[PDB]
Amino acid sequence: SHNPVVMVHGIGGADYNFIGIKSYLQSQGWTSSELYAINFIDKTGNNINNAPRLSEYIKRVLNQTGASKVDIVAHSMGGANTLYYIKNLDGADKVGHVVTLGGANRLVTNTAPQNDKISYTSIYSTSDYIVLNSLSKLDGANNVQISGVSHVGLLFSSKVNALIKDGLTAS
Ligand SMILES: [Cl-]
């Protein structure tokens, strides 16, 4: 069955940003009670606070469920928080699949960490006016470029939803 999914919002974001994606994954066979969206109290996106918070949240998810790994879907600065956690903290042995949506990924690294053991997908839109695609493209990820969708639109797009499902089941 699927790993628990942890969804990670960006600057000025919230857990409820992921309501569309949760409803989609539930319709595709994921269990609602194994879809987790963190709510950062720090809305500035600061890796210093949010990456350890993410680490602790995932450990609680692993401890509560008994799963060995989580998958992550991250939006915007949430992608940077996620890559900081994997690269600089403890996340490299805790994650199966990582899917970023307009992620501000190269603020942390140009290369997806341990991308032979962790499966990475980076989805981004040429109409994104908040995060440039050059920031989202990640060496060692499946980089998927689409058109016509806005930065927040990435959270409420049927095309993106299908790409997320592919990213969460990549081999
Ligand atoms: Cl935009």
Side-chain angles (χ1 to χ4, degrees):
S1 55
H2 298 118
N3 289 337
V5 184
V6 174
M7 303 174 193
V8 185
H9 73 76
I11 290 168
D15 51 359
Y16 54 73
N17 290 166
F18 285 99
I19 185 168
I21 287 162
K22 282 195 178 187
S23 294
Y24 173 76
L25 294 177
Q26 286 156 21
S27 81
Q28 298 294 323
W30 278 255
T31 295
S32 65
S33 49
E34 304 304 338
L35 299 178
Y36 299 86
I38 191 167
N39 195 47
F40 294 124
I41 192 64
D42 183 352
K43 304 297 193 184
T44 73
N46 195 323
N47 291 316
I48 281 175
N49 296 326
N50 290 357
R53 293 305 82 77
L54 177 58
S55 171
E56 290 154 14
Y57 189 90
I58 282 164
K59 285 166 179 188
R60 294 191 297 276
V61 172
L62 295 176
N63 288 339
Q64 284 160 7
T65 65
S68 64
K69 297 183 186 303
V70 303
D71 297 332
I72 296 172
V73 180
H75 181 237
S76 199
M77 192 66 196
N81 296 162
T82 295
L83 292 171
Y84 190 102
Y85 158 63
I86 292 173
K87 180 175 183 293
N88 302 132
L89 308 180
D90 62 290
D93 68 350
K94 309 241 182 6
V95 178
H97 303 76
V98 173
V99 180
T100 65
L101 312 173
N105 294 332
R106 293 196 175 229
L107 295 181
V108 171
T109 180
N110 298 343
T111 299
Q114 313 291 306
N115 60 62
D116 57 337
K117 302 168 174 300
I118 301 175
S119 173
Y120 292 85
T121 297
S122 178
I123 297 152
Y124 43 86
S125 172
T126 58
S127 277
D128 195 318
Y129 302 139
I130 301 296
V131 177
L132 291 169
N133 295 173
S134 54
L135 267 201
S136 301
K137 185 182 176 195
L138 214 43
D139 296 352
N142 187 28
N143 294 297
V144 184
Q145 190 175 51
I146 64 181
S147 58
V149 185
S150 66
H151 189 64
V152 171
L154 295 170
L155 296 166
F156 302 100
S157 162
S158 63
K159 181 171 200 86
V160 171
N161 287 343
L163 292 169
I164 294 166
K165 178 180 178 194
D166 293 341
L168 292 175
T169 56
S171 304

